[PDB]
Design a protein around this ligand. Structure first.
Ligand SMILES: Nc1ncnc2c1ncn2[C@@H]1O[C@H](C[C@@H](N)CC[C@H](N)C(=O)O)[C@@H](O)[C@H]1O
Ligand SMILES: Nc1ncnc2c1ncn2[C@@H]1O[C@H](C[C@@H](N)CC[C@H](N)C(=O)O)[C@@H](O)[C@H]1O
Lengths: 240, 240
């Protein structure tokens, strides 16, 4: 299947980072993922193509100018046609996690609005935006990196395009050549050829790492009997 | 002051998204921020410049090949000289938040290692990496977008380069022209010219929004007396 993403951005060339390189670049070249961009600057009418505006109430910073941004959004909505969810990237939005990625990946079309400066007029959020999403509790200069983050995370769910959080757990450690690196050996179980011992080792590692690093993640999980056993074993070894 | 960031990446051209555009692009052009990249592919010796390798233990996926990546890291460390903290971007790392951004922005030099495929050998993390950092609880195809996210967030703290989370709170809504948009008016207080009423309105909005959207964030805060009062007022209005 295929996903279409419309993007509204003052810096559409930023999106080459995902459309020209790696797994996502190959998805775009093979038409599994389509990304189309509209730039508010192209919707300005004044001589200097002004895309910012002063905030009412004074104070510092500038906002994106309403008219060019609104017009861009309307053009993208017309292109997307029916059924396209419009998302504004913002640190005030729903914090993205793998559950949220799986929800978003159920959409065949999304339009992603990328802010710049201090953001966008609150009434455009009310009138044009369906959902606000954050990539994390930190502030960036623009919504393009968050949009690309979202695109990359969802694109991994597109069939044909290709884990931590997959089953709620951090990933296990991985090893490749050489067998010994600075005196550190690959765990012998991984060279044993024993698929079931390997499976159990990787799962116990994931449990152990999640417990030590992110114990709060473990709370939200309903572990299988095997997972409970392997976790107890890891905790007992840690104590020992 | 100035920050130097060394990056290890198979796709260094991705970083044009931050070095050529917007506030971060201007920081780079003005030498406030320097980003230097090393590509493991340039450290290969075989005819086809192989940069991946098979994981011990079978199963799917590939890892970054150890030797080219190790060699790249060593070249970057030599360039950074003394005092450079080496960070691996990974969903198994410390989850980035504004507190973590402020900590990271205290470094004059960082080297950021970007994984691809299923990641990197665990022993390289032990032998070469100082800290592991995640941008969020979701899985991406590569560490370049996370690295750029980190770079952008920290660059905002570089003097001369230029909020939500700043004082622990979500940002207030902002408004710009026109005064009426699809029947929605700018709050009159913001046109009143009264700086103190405006200050209080924006703070009460931040409190209200944080309470409604992210009540867990409010718990971690020690509110001022004024903030407690404004929050109580907002809650009373919400009830009314
Ligand atoms: N964590 C984030 N998640 C999603 N988008 C973000 C994030 N941080 C910044 N942005 C984008 O960057 C744009 C410009 C920001 N400097 C505005 C920040 C705004 N003053 C705030 O603190 O909420 C915002 O309009 C968003 O589109
Ligand atoms: N949330 C994230 N934060 C930081 N780096 C990430 C994140 N997600 C993916 N990456 C980078 O993307 C690379 C390739 C990933 N597909 C590997 C994921 C690994 N299998 C895991 O689940 O932990 C990783 O080596 C990281 O460098």
């Amino acid at each position: 299947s295929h996903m279409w993403i419309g993007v509204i951005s003052l810096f559409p060339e930023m999106f080459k980072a995902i459309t020209e390189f790696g797994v996502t670049g190959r998805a775009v070249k093979h038409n599994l993922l389509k990304v189309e961009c509209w730039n508010p600057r192209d919707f300005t009418f004044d001589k200097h193509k002004t895309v910012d505006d002063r905030p009412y109430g004074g104070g510092p910073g500038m906002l994106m100018m309403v008219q060019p941004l609104r017009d861009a959004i309307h053009t993208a909505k017309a292109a997307a046609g029916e059924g396209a969810k419009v998302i504004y990237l913002s640190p005030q939005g729903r914090k993205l996690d793998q559950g949220g990625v799986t929800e978003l990946a159920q959409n065949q079309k999304l339009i992603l609005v990328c802010g710049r400066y201090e953001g966008i007029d609150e009434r455009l959020i009310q009138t044009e935006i369906d959902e606000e999403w954050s990539i994390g509790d930190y502030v960036l200069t623009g919504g393009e990196l968050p949009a690309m983050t979202l695109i990359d995370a969802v694109a991994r769910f597109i069939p044909g395009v290709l884990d931590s959080f997959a089953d709620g757990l951090l990933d296990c450690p991985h090893y490749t050549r050489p067998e010994v690196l600075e005196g550190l050996t690959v765990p012998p179980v991984l060279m044993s050829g024993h698929h079931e011992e390997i499976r159990k080792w990787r799962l116990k590692q994931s449990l152990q790492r999640t417990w030590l690093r992110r114990p709060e993640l473990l709370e939200g999980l309903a572990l299988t009997d095997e997972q409970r056993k392997l976790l107890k074993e890891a905790q007992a070894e840690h104590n020992s």
